[PDB]
Each structure stands twice: as C-alpha cells, then as structure tokens.
Design a protein around this ligand. Structure first.
Ligand SMILES: *[C@@H]1O[C@H](CO)[C@@H](O)[C@H](O)[C@H]1NC(C)=O
Ligand SMILES: *[C@@H]1O[C@H](CO)[C@@H](O)[C@H](O)[C@H]1NC(C)=O
Ligand SMILES: *[C@@H]1O[C@H](CO)[C@@H](O)[C@H](O)[C@H]1NC(C)=O
Ligand SMILES: *[C@@H]1O[C@H](CO)[C@@H](O)[C@H](O)[C@H]1NC(C)=O
Ligand SMILES: *[C@@H]1O[C@H](CO)[C@@H](O)[C@H](O)[C@H]1NC(C)=O
Ligand SMILES: *[C@@H]1O[C@H](CO)[C@@H](O)[C@H](O)[C@H]1NC(C)=O
Ligand SMILES: [Cl-]
Ligand SMILES: [Cl-]
Ligand SMILES: [Zn+2]
Ligand SMILES: [Zn+2]
Lengths: 98, 595, 595
C-alpha cells in the first residue's frame, strides 16, 4: 500500500537455527547481552520479530513475492492422491484396446 | 557472548530501522521537491525530525561500545560513522549558540541585497542581476563597483559572526580528540585499522601541496594567456608583468572562468561544436535523451535501470502548474528506488548533464548490496568523479557522430580541438588555484597559525602568490572576503572539489588504457568497452566498505593521489600555450597593484 | 623430533610419577592429622622430603627447555609452574639465611608469651586467654594494655628480622626476572600467551584501587554506625568526628568485627536466626548434616560423592583416644580419593562449615580430568570463593525451612534481615579496608617506595586514611605492627582474601539471574537450579588449564574484576545505614588522636 503494508512480520534474531520443517511463533525478547532483561525492551534486549512495510515504489528486489513450497514424501502408503488419468470415447462394433 | 556479537546484533537492527525511516524521509523530500505545497512541506518537517531524532538516539546507544576490542574491519567502519557524537559534545549554551550563527549566516547570504547610489530603489540581490553584470557587462567601472559593494555589505556583517564561528568550531573538534575543525574535514580521507593502506590526516595536506607543484606550470601559462588577451578588452588597467584584478575573472568570486571564453577565445571565426540545432531537427525530447544515454551505459557493461525509474521519476517539467526545483539532483530513496529530478530541455548542456545524473545512479546501484552505514562512495570526491567522466566521454566528437547528432560529413580540425581544451581549462584547471588557497587558508585559521588581526592580509597575500590575482582597492581588516562564498558561510567542505578534479583524470587515464586508445586523452570514449566497465564496476560496488586507497588501486592502480593524468589531458593545450605565451613575460608580480 | 615433542614426553612421565608420590605424601599427611603419633610423624617426614626432592630434581631437568619455541598453551602453562626455580637462584649462604629467618619468625610468633606487671607468674600466650580478653572484656584499660603489650614484645623482636626479610626476598625475586617480591605474589593473576584475555601484573594494583573506590561509601557509613554505637559502651574515649582506637575493634589486629555484634546490635530484643536447638530435638548428628548437605549439591546439578568418601573420611571425633586436628580441612589425596577432616558437632556453625568443606570437594572433583600441574583452581581466590557461596545459599531462611530446620509457622521480618546483613558486614566488607591497606603497604616496601626509617609512620598514616583507625599511644620506630599478623610473619599472601571476597558476590550475582530470583541478593538460593549448576560446573571443570579471566566469563560474563555485585548485596543495608547515620558527621578525621 501507499502508506506501507506492515502486516507481514519476520524473525530477525534467534538463539539458534531452526530445524527443517519447524514452525516457531515465540515472541520472547532475544537476550543479546549478558542479562535476560527480565522480559523488557532495552539495550541488548531486542524484539525478535521485525516488520517489512511493503510499498509499490520499491525495487524489484524489495517487492513482496508470495512463495509456496510443495513438500512431497512417500511413506509406503497406498498413494490415495493421484492426478487425472485419461478421457476417451467408446468405440462400438470394433475390437480395440480397453 | 563477546562485545563483537553485540555489535553485529545492534547493526542488524539499525540497518533494518534506518532503511525504513530513511526511505520515508527521502519520499517526503521527493514530494516536496516535485511539488512545492504546504502539505508536502509538513510531510518533510515531521519526517525530518523523526529521522534526526532516530539517528541521535541510536548514536547514543552506540557509544556504549569501547570499539577497541572489535577486530572486524566491516563492523568497525560502520560504528565509526555512527558513534560520532558531533556537536553534541559541547554544553547546551554552546550548542544553541553555534546553531544560531549557522542560521543567520544563511539568511544574510540569501536575503543579502546591496543598494546603489545611482538610484535609491535600484537594489538587486545576489543570483539575479548581479551575476549577469559580472558575466556579460564589459564596462570596467560597472563590474568594479558591483564586486566591491557586495563584499562591503556582506563581508562587514559576517565578520563579527565569522570570528565567533571559528572559536566555536575549534572547541568542538578538540573535544572530539582532534586538533582543530580543519582536521575534522580532512578526517574523511583518514584510513586506519588495515596495514599497507593507511592514510593519515596530516598526509592529505602534504598530498595537495605536492600535486599542486605540477599544476603551477600549466596554470602560469594559462594565466599569462588570459592576461594577454584581456589587454585589448580592458586597456590602461592591466600590467604586462602584473597580476589580474578580481573583478575581471567573469564571476563575483572568480571561481570559474567560463565567462571569459567570449573574450579570450583563440579562434572566434569558427563556432564551437554544438548539437542544439541538430536535436530539434530530429524531433528529440527529454525521453529520447535518457534513452540514448542509457544505451551508452549498457554498452560499457552496466545493467539497465529499474522499472520504477522510468515511471516514478519526472524528467520533464509539466509547466507552471506543479512547481518543482529545476536543479538536476540524483535521488536515491533506497530499497531499489532510484529517481532523477531534472527539467531536461532540448539543449546540449542538458545532454551532458543527463549523463552526469545517470552516472550517479549507476554508482548508487553498485553498492546497493552494502549496509546503510556503508551505502555511500569512497569519499566526498569519488561520487562526483564518476559522474563527470561520463559527460566528458559523451562530449567527444566521435560519440556525437556515432549516435546521430553530428553529420558524418564533418572531420575535426586542430582549431576546434584547441578551443575545446581551452574552454574546459577555464572551469576544470582554472579553479584549482582558487580551491587550493581557499582550503589552505582556512586550515590555518582553525589551527591558529593566522592571528585574528591578519585574516584579510594573509588572504590577499596567498591570492597574489598562488592564484595571481591582485586586489583592486585596499580593503580594511573589518572586511571578510571568504565569508562571501556560499560554501564557506554555510559550513560546507570545499576540498571535495579539488580531489574530485584530480580523481576525474585518474579514472579517465585508467579507462583509456583498457579501451585500447590510440590518441590524446580528450578523444577517448569508454563506449563499447566491456573490460573498462567491468574494472570500473568492481570499484563502484565496494562503495564505502573499503578504503579509498584500496578502491583507487582497482581502477587506476595507484595507492596515492596523482596529478600526472591531469597534465596529460591538457598536454596538447600546454604545448599550444607555451608557443603563444612567448611575446610577454610569463608569470605575475605580487608587488604590483592597480591602486 | 622438535622441542615440543620432548616437552610432552617429559610431562607424561612427570604426571605419572607425581600423582603416585603426591598420593603417598597426602596419605602420610592424612595419617598424621587423623592420629598424632610418633609413627605417623616419621611417615610424614620421610615422605615429605621424598616429594620435596622429587619436585626439585624434576624442576632442574625442566630448565633445559627454552620455553620460547613451544606454542601449545597447555604445555606452556604446565612448564611455567614447574620450571620456576624459586629461592634456589640465590647462593648457598643466602638460601640458608633466608630459611633461618622464616623458621625463627614462626617460633617467636607461636611461642610468644607476654608477661604482665600485675603478677610475675600470670603470663598468657596468643591464642588462649589473650583473644578472650580482646573479644569479651569491656574494660577500656584492660584491652588497651593487652593490645599494646603484645606488639611491644613481638614487634620489637621481629623488627630486626623483618628488615633482613625484605632485602632477601627482594634480591630473590629480582633474580627471577621480576621487579620485587611484591610482584611475585601478584604473578599468580598474570595471564600471557593468549590474545584477548591477557592480564598484566601491574593491572592488578590498578584493579584493587579502582574497585576500592566504591567500597569506601559503603564502609564510611558502616564505620560511622559502629562509632556511634560504641560511644555508650566506651564513653569519654571516642570523638564524635574522630577515628576509632585499634583496641576497640574486637580483635588483636582488628581483622574481623564479629566480636562487635554484641555491642553494635541494631535490634537486640529479637535473637538471631539459630537452628542449634532445632537439631537436638530431631536427634541429628554429624552423619545427618553431611547427608542433608549432599542433597543440596545434587539438587543444583552436581554428582554424588565417591564410595571412599563416606568410608575413609572421619566426620566425628572418637573422643580423647585418637588425637586429631579439630580444624575443618578439605583433603584431596588424588586418584579419586577425597576426604574431609572435621569434628562436626551439633551446631549451626558446623552446618554452614559443612557446606564449605563439601563445596571444595565438588571443585576438586571437577578438574580431576586435568594434569597434576593444572589440578588446581583458577587462582588463590577462586577456590575459597566457591566454598563460601554454598554456605551463604544454605544460610538463607528459605533453605532452612525447606529441609525441616525452621518451623513453617515463622515468617521473616525486616528487623531480622537488617541484623543478618549487618552481622555479615562485620566479617565480609569490614575486613576489606584492613586487607587493602595491608597489601598496598607491603607492595611499597618490597618495591622501595617506603624507606626503612618510615615503616611505622606510613603504616599508621594509611590506617588513619583508609581504615580510619587511630593509634591509641605513640609507637617508636623500633616497633613492627605488620609482623604481629600470622600471614605476614609466616610469608603468606594476604591479597587472596580480598579477591575472593569480590569474586564471592560475582558468582552469587551470576547464579541468581539463572535461578530466576525475584528478591534481594541475600535471599537467593541456588537450590533446585539445574541451569545454575551446569553453568558453574563448566568453570570448575577447567580449573587451572584456562586463565582466570576466561573462566570468570563463563559464569559471571565479565572479563575484569568487578565490585558492583558486592554493593548490590548490602544495598538494603546501605539504605538502612544512611537513614541512621544522619545524627552525626559521617567520616573520620585523621588529625585527631586520643593521646
Ligand atoms: C565481519 O562482519 C561481516 C558482516 O557481518 C561478516 O560477514 C564477517 O564474517 C565478519 N568477519 C569476522 C572475522 O568476524
Ligand atoms: C534494459 O533492461 C532490459 C531488461 O532485461 C535489458 O534486456 C536491456 O538490454 C536494457 N537496455 C535497453 C537499451 O533496453
Ligand atoms: C559502439 O557501438 C554502437 C553499436 O551500434 C555503434 O553504433 C557505435 O558507433 C560504437 N562506438 C564506437 C566508438 O565504437
Ligand atoms: C597441547 O597439549 C595438550 C596436553 O598434552 C594436548 O592435549 C593438546 O592436543 C596439545 N595441543 C597441540 C596443538 O599440540
Ligand atoms: C526443591 O523443591 C522441593 C519441592 O518444593 C523441596 O522439597 C526440596 O527441598 C527443594 N530442594 C532443596 C535443595 O531444598
Ligand atoms: C549417590 O551416588 C549414586 C551413584 O550412582 C547415585 O545413584 C545416588 O542418586 C546419589 N545419591 C545422592 C543423595 O546424591
Ligand atoms: Cl575574494
Ligand atoms: Cl596494627
Ligand atoms: Zn553531480
Ligand atoms: Zn575454605
């Protein structure tokens, strides 16, 4: 938006790296110094989440890009999901391959 | 966690918060310059103090780092540009007093109006009328009165304010572990923390003096040539072996000698190379100029502009319905947003200026992958140097005839080359002695080598020896000549115009070798040179993350500033001046005076 | 093979031979302390010279290594502790002369007996009788005579020996590439060979002086409070704005002010928190105390004791049939053998002391995987610091009521907290000025800043300014006050009692943050804190294999010594003292004297 779309947030500081396919929604104050700050915002007490503020006048590298990931895995299942197979007509009075 | 981990964490948050707020201030400033309305002024004011207060509160929190345990050169250079306290070291009374002096100097310089005894209601301000007389009027007594009356009304009023301006700036810099306020300006070129590429602040003074020793032989023959031609235009006032007056340089301050081309023209029978009439015949406009200019940059090996450039930037004035600044300025809002504000007309001057503004954008897009604290050039002269080598490469006769401006049935001659080199010398090398003496004089004022009762005496003494300009009338000590300049009264560094001039020829000489040039330096064209653009892009991409000494070696290959490429550019002009400056005594006598 | 391979081979044989011989000496010393018999004395003598001669012959062979080619920090630190020649650098005559002075000083100090003019056969030695008068007797003239007569008989006899003790120790340290003998004691905290964590010997003097600047405001209000309360107990002898006498501090030397609690008690109506009567009602013994203490250490995250601990160590005196030392001492025989010799009685003092001895064993078992030359703490103060934080964490009212000592129908009040903090201040922070002036005085004696004819003058001058204690009677230059102390005459470092005091609060403040404490520092308990024990165990495991600066960062997080946690502990007491020390002038005048 023209006024800035600050609805999308991202985590910038964390204690350690995330595992594959891990989701963490914790908003605890990141301890960057020596004391845990007792859960307040201050020097060496930074908030993990940061906003984007997308604007239409930004560059190509800064425009928002909706990214979707399609995770696929096979666990020796009956494979219930399957795409479309085929669709043909019905031949009559003639030997064909069905 | 060590102190280095806390510094990197502080910078990661600061870079995210700065780019968001700096874009809002740049966008608010863009709306003000593109449309002068009360709504846009308020948007610039509130966003101005918001960014000013943000930079102050973040700098205060950055002072909690000793900076001596950190060994990372990238983290150290960013904190040095952020932990700088500035004028906040002094007390509350000295802070408001210094800001008050800086405010009244700009108002007096802008709203300064000198009255004339010819008519009580015929007073004119600085920019309109006054500069027209100093440039086009040929009367001796007319431009002499206008030159002295301006400094008589502005210098006498700024002299009591300038005496307090020096003592306040000296005590502010000394509190920041410096020697004087003049050393604070020279601190930009300071390089420390990396062996093999260091550069002390005191070495800059020795560098300018050593390089100026070779500019004098080129300037002495240039000053003697202009003096010989002005004898016919201003007779019975110029001495054959004496200096030149200050009101005959073509400007109020004598910075540029562009106005002297109409009087000191070598060959006035043939006009200069102008493509103004060639553009109106082909139905060109502002859009065609930037398209032809973009084709030049992509031929050297630079990427194309972003999509928002041709859509958001206003390259044509819509008329008298949306007021905008007619001055060409490169706008880098950030986050991939690059705009250019310029009222581009159908004129050859706007064609060369278009490449100047477009060259600065190519520089800004190079270091776009750098942090905000390093999102700048190597120094205050590296930015303007890249923007001017593009205009000189585009002003060549071979480039003009290749794009369709010059007719193919036109071959350059020796007379056109001499007029081209001499015209450029009036604005490129002609301002070097003026810039040299102005900086060296102020450097001694802030340091204390010149007493308060000898400001005007040492100013004219250096003008006679370095530039070779004699004062027309005796001036009392109450006057103040340096305060008459815009860059001096508004607290602006003027040494950036000297280093950029020398760096301009260093880059031109470094690109002609890669382009396989076979002629003079002024005929070189960096067009269609992929190896020249790739070598230049490696330096522009670094920006401020690397010292200027290391960046200069990537293109030029020299670790120290060099003035030799400057002499090679005007080498054909030097041989032509020495052949003509043989009928009179070369040089000037400082003992002579017109009074 | 390089010199590094020969050093590692020498250490592998030395560590194997040392642990075998050191265990025999520790086992022979254990049998001597647990049973005083002529058979055990001989077993300690022959094993004593066996280990002494072994350490000497191995140190001589270690001198063949230049130590400059080796780059391994582990091998270098072990050789520095082994290649130290010591007193063997001097000649044969100076070696026996220095040992003779050290022997006669211990005999005179131990067998010192002062006669009294009241009766020719009523003389008493130092420990019995004399210390009882200086602690319990309230008569002014009685304790004044006992204070002066002791230094008159011991100081006058040790003064000729102390003058030769300094010159011999100075020439011995200077031969070892040091400045003076005072620098040799400060060499323990020296860290070299690793960038980012170095610590020079000269920085220790600046560290103690800088940290002492913040202890004075806390001590000035403490000294003024004790002075105001002693006016009613000793009238017509204490000045309202003057200093305090040396015979009214509760001890012969005034090191601890524990004997002043009975006179300077804030609220004497309510008794202090004592669990002596609570243990005899539940039929407790020495075995139950160590079992309850072991449950405390394992709750924080420390492993359980070995099987040989509860079987070989004697925690109860069998009576007057096998004489043993009643002093609690932690015995680390080596090779997984850890014993504690202490006559633990049914008393609250023995309960806190049990955690002190048990805390040292947990330290020794931590660095058990380290070589013999590194099988020690970080310095001379790191060992006692860990042993005292366990006693303070156990003396909290919350820990006493959780194990069953205090009844659940008892809530602490403000009056009990003030009496607890003030009683601890008489022994923890009350000895800091005495330790500060005693070390700084001797550091100037060995260096040479104090002449021989100004030892007693500079001693009392520093006592008046730093501690604020005025001399009762004028003392001639022939006296020797510092020699009256046990640690000074027996050549024992006394600075270890100052660094340990500051390190005690640094560890307590570092563990309260991990334990998620929500109150004052004196109410913290490290019990049931797994994260606090794991962080502390990472530092105790390193021991001496890592510098004390790096080890301090693992728990506290600071690279330099800090006194701020010391002030936060007595912060409620500081505000209480300032509220009460307002009826008189705070401070002391050094110009005043009772004579
Ligand atoms: C220095 O900082 C930069 C930017 O965070 C980082 O990429 C680089 O790895 C750092 N180098 C060192 C030696 O810490
Ligand atoms: C402009 O940008 C496009 C983007 O891919 C590029 O293909 C083109 O070469 C650039 N230059 C011109 C003159 O179109
Ligand atoms: C550069 O290449 C363009 C491409 O057509 C050409 O028109 C122009 O003449 C060339 N200029 C030079 C100096 O070779
Ligand atoms: C240093 O010595 C220690 C102890 O012998 C050994 O464990 C370590 O591997 C050595 N390191 C090097 C680099 O030689
Ligand atoms: C830990 O907490 C439990 C339950 O509150 C308590 O019984 C136990 O005594 C605590 N640990 C210590 C060492 O006091
Ligand atoms: C004593 O040590 C043994 C060793 O395995 C352990 O199992 C037990 O829990 C410990 N007990 C206490 C009270 O620490
Ligand atoms: Cl001037
Ligand atoms: Cl004493
Ligand atoms: Zn420019
Ligand atoms: Zn102990």
């Amino acid at each position: 938006k023209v006024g800035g779309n600050y609805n999308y947030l991202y985590r910038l500081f964390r204690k350690s790296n995330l595992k594959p396919f891990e989701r963490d929604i914790s908003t605890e104050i990141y301890q960057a110094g020596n004391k845990p700050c007792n859960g307040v915002a201050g020097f060496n007490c930074y908030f993990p989440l940061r906003s984007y503020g997308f604007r239409p006048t930004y560059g190509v590298g800064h425009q928002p890009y909706r990214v979707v990931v399609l995770s696929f895995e096979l666990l020796h299942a009956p494979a219930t999901v399957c795409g479309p197979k085929k669709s043909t007509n019905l031949v009559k009075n003639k030997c064909v391959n069905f | 966690s060590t102190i280095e981990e806390q510094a990197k964490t502080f910078l990661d948050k600061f870079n995210h918060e700065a780019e968001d707020l700096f874009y809002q201030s740049s966008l608010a400033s863009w709306n003000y310059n593109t449309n002068i309305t009360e709504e846009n002024v308020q948007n610039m004011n509130n966003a101005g103090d918001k960014w000013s207060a943000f930079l102050k509160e973040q700098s205060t929190l950055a002072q909690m780092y000793p900076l001596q345990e950190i060994q990372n050169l990238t983290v150290k250079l960013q904190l040095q540009a952020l932990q700088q306290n500035g004028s906040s070291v002094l007390s509350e009374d000295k802070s408001k007093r210094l800001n008050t002096i800086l405010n009244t100097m700009s108002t007096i310089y802008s709203t300064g109006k000198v009255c004339n005894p010819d008519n009580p209601q015929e007073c004119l301000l600085l920019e309109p009328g006054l500069n027209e007389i100093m440039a086009n009027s040929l009367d001796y007594n007319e431009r002499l009165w206008a030159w002295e009356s301006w400094r008589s009304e502005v210098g006498k009023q700024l002299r009591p304010l300038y005496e307090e301006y020096v003592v306040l700036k000296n005590e502010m810099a000394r509190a920041n572990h410096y020697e004087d306020y003049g050393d604070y300006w020279r601190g930009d070129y300071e390089v420390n923390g990396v062996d093999g590429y260091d550069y002390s602040r005191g070495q800059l003074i020795e560098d300018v003096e050593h390089t100026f020793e070779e500019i004098k032989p080129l300037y002495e023959h240039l000053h003697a040539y202009v003096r010989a031609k002005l004898m016919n235009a201003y007779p019975s006032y110029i001495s054959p072996i004496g200096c030149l007056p200050a009101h005959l340089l073509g400007d109020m301050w004598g910075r540029f000698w562009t106005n002297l081309y109409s009087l000191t023209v070598p060959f006035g029978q043939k006009p200069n190379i102008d493509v103004t009439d060639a553009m109106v015949d082909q139905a060109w406009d502002a859009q065609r100029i930037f398209k032809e200019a973009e084709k030049f940059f992509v031929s050297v090996g630079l990427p194309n502009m972003t999509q928002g450039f041709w859509e958001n930037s206003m390259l044509t004035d819509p008329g008298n319905v949306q007021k905008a600044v007619c001055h060409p300025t490169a706008w880098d809002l950030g986050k991939g947003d690059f705009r250019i504000l310029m009222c581009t007309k159908v004129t050859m001057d706007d064609f060369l200026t278009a490449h100047h503004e477009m060259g600065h954008i190519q520089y800004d897009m190079a270091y776009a992958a750098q942090p905000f604290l390093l999102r700048n050039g190597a120094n205050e002269g590296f930015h303007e140097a890249v923007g001017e080598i593009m205009s000189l490469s585009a002003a060549t006769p071979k480039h003009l005839k290749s794009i369709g401006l010059l007719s193919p049935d036109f071959q350059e001659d020796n007379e056109t080359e001499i007029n081209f080199l001499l015209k450029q010398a009036l604005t490129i090398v002609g301002t070097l002695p003026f810039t040299y003496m102005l900086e060296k004089w102020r450097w001694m004022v802030f340091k204390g080598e010149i007493p308060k009762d000898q400001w005007m005496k040492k100013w004219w003494e250096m003008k006679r020896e370095i530039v070779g300009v004699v004062e027309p009338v005796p001036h009392d000590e109450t006057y103040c000549d340096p305060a008459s300049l815009f860059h001096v009264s508004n607290d602006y560094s003027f040494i950036r115009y000297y280093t950029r001039t020398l760096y301009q020829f260093q880059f031109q000489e470094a690109l002609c070798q890669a382009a396989k040039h076979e002629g003079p330096l002024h005929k070189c064209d960096i067009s269609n040179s992929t190896e020249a653009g790739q070598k230049l892009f490696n330096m522009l991409r670094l920006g401020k993350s690397e010292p200027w000494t290391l960046a200069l070696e990537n293109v030029v290959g020299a670790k120290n500033m060099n003035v030799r490429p400057l002499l090679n550019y005007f080498e054909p002009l030097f041989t032509w001046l020495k052949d003509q400056n043989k009928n009179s005594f070369v040089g000037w006598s400082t003992d002579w005076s017109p009074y």
